[PDB]
Amino acid sequence: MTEYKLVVVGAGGVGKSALTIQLIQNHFVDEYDPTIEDSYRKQVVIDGETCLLDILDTAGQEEYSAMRDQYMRTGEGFLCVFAINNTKSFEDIHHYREQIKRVKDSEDVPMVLVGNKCDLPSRTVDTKQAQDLARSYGIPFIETSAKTRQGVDDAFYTLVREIRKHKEK
Ligand SMILES: Nc1nc2c(ncn2[C@@H]2O[C@H](COP(=O)(O)OP(=O)(O)O)[C@@H](O)[C@H]2O)c(=O)[nH]1
Ligand SMILES: CN(C)CCCN1c2ccccc2Sc2ccccc21
């Protein structure tokens, strides 16, 4: 069994802690503290390969920038989640990609763009806008919802393959 370290990044409220729990507990949580950081391990067999997923739900700001950059260097796959009804989070995805790339000092980093809250209206971020950004980074983009669980599993599954491609490259 191969172990995969994945970190979900985004703004406070995009639903990172919801997506992570949806894969672990298999149930949506309407109320959960965003500041509480917790990493979960899940044994899944994708593509015939049994892999243990180590997903960490970060809060945002760390006490020490040292450990902050550290948790960004140990991660092999990073899930970029934003809210389609919150352009503020989508625009922050720009600095998120930039930062992590500088932390690991690389050009090619296994990442996936995820647009959560697709079930909710007031869609400020259009699909094309996100796809355009993803296209620039050279990574896949998937619209999801932690409520109805649409594309949530697929997003994680895709990230795993993204990591693999970088490993066999
Ligand atoms: N309606 C809706 N709310 C969501 C969704 N995902 C997360 N939320 C809500 O976003 C708020 C914060 O969730 P939280 O677990 O803190 O996620 P995070 O802090 O963004 O990582 C809570 O009200 C969650 O129920 C979603 O997909 N749909
Ligand atoms: C403590 N270990 C059993 C889990 C560590 C998980 N971890 C994390 C997970 C995936 C990529 C990077 C990181 S760095 C980090 C930071 C805080 C807590 C746990 C971790």
Curated annotation (Swiss-Prot):
Catalytic activity: GTP + H2O = GDP + phosphate + H(+)
Family: Belongs to the small GTPase superfamily. Ras family.
MF terms in GO: G protein activity; GDP binding; GMP binding; GTP binding; GTPase activity; identical protein binding; LRR domain binding; protein-containing complex binding
Effect of D38A: Decreased interaction with MAPKAP1/SIN1
The protein's role, per its UniProt record: Ras proteins bind GDP/GTP and possess intrinsic GTPase activity. Plays an important role in the regulation of cell proliferation. Plays a role in promoting oncogenic events by inducing transcriptional silencing of tumor suppressor genes (TSGs) in colorectal cancer (CRC) cells in a ZNF304-dependent manner.
Effect caused by changing Q22E: In CFC2; exhibits an increase in intrinsic and guanine nucleotide exchange factor catalyzed nucleotide exchange in combination with an impaired GTPase-activating protein-stimulated GTP hydrolysis but functional in interaction with effectors
Annotated keywords: Acetylation, Cardiomyopathy, Cell membrane, Cytoplasm, Deafness, Disease variant, Ectodermal dysplasia, Glycoprotein, GTP-binding, Hydrolase, Intellectual disability, Isopeptide bond, Lipoprotein, Membrane, Methylation, Nucleotide-binding, Palmitate, Prenylation, Proto-oncogene, Ubl conjugation
InterPro entries (alphabetical): P-loop_NTPase (IPR027417), Small_GTP-bd (IPR005225), Small_GTPase (IPR001806), Small_GTPase_Ras-type (IPR020849)
Effect listed in the UniProt record for changing G12D: In GASC, JMML and SFM; somatic mutation; also found in pancreatic carcinoma and lung carcinoma; also found in metastatic colorectal cancer
Subunit structure: Interacts with PHLPP. Interacts (active GTP-bound form preferentially) with RGS14. Interacts (when farnesylated) with PDE6D; this promotes dissociation from the cell membrane. Interacts with SOS1. Interacts (when farnesylated) with GPR31. Interacts with RAP1GDS1. Interacts (active GTP-bound form) with both SHOC2 and PP1c (all isoforms) to form a tertiary complex; SHOC2 and PP1c preferably bind M-Ras/MRAS, but they also bind K-Ras/KRAS, N-Ras/NRAS and H-Ras/HRAS. Interacts (GTP-bound form) with MAPKAP1/SIN1; inhibiting K-Ras/KRAS activity.
Membrane topology field: Lipid-anchor
Gene name per UniProt: KRAS
Activity regulation information from UniProt: Alternates between an inactive form bound to GDP and an active form bound to GTP. Activated by a guanine nucleotide-exchange factor (GEF) and inactivated by a GTPase-activating protein (GAP). Interaction with SOS1 promotes exchange of bound GDP to GTP.
Effect of A146V: In OES; somatic mutation
Annotated glycosylation sites: T35
Protein name as annotated: GTPase KRas
Modified residues (N-acetylthreonine): T2
GO biological process, one term: neuron apoptotic process
Reported impact of Q61L: Promotes GTP binding
Outcome when changing G60R: In CFC2; characterized by a defective GTPase-activating protein sensitivity and a strongly reduced interaction with effectors
Covalent S-S links between cysteines: none
Annotated source species: Homo sapiens
Variant or mutagenesis effect after changing Y40A: Decreased interaction with MAPKAP1/SIN1
Localisation: Cell membrane; Endomembrane system; Cytoplasm, Cytosol
Effect of Q22R: In NS3; impairs GTPase-activating protein stimulated GTP hydrolysis with unaffected intrinsic functions and a virtually functional effector interaction
Effect recorded for T58I: In NS3; affects activity and impairs responsiveness to GTPase activating proteins; exhibits only minor alterations in its in vitro biochemical behavior compared to wild-type protein
Motif (Effector region): 32-40
Outcome recorded upon mutating Q61H: In lung carcinoma
